[PDB]
Design a protein around this ligand. Sequence first.
Ligand SMILES: Cc1nn(C)cc1[C@H]1CC[C@@H](CO)N1c1ncnc2[nH]ccc12
Length: 167
Amino acid sequence: VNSFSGYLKLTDNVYIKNADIVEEAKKVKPTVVVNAANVYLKHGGGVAGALNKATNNAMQVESDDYIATNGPLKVGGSCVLSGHNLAKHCLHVVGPNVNKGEDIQLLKSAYENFNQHEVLLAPLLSAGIFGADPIHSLRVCVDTVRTNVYLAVFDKNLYDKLVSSFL
Ligand SMILES: Cc1nn(C)cc1[C@H]1CC[C@@H](CO)N1c1ncnc2[nH]ccc12
């Protein structure tokens, strides 16, 4: 039993809700919140911009030190950093950004990072400003993640379509 509330159950391990991931994290304080990161950990917009703003830019400060030490992530890769006031940890995961021409096949690799964590709050990778088809992202999520994932979808219209079209 966990404290996630109001989710629709899609499969044995995948759950979905129309929610603002910032507000969900603040309420639940999950062990792991997933960020829709880029390889530079520049949290300027999209989910990343919103999560960072909610930390009063502390996420960005920590991220800049991470990059200065380690260099950029790989597309499809991840790193674990602090969750600040939102979660114990933040798993920064880089899905391909179609608006950069990045291989959508890397979306499965991106979701594989979730399997290193027993329970996560997460957005649909490569959705929103990363330009991928959110229906496809949900399919890859369900077919790749085996741990318990609670998916937050900001846009109410898109959520209804993901549910209604889910196979
Ligand atoms: C814009 C945007 N850019 N990216 C990378 C994702 C999004 C939006 C669109 C689709 C949805 C994916 O779950 N997503 C969010 N979902 C939940 N909380 C959120 N807070 C802020 C954004 C957001």
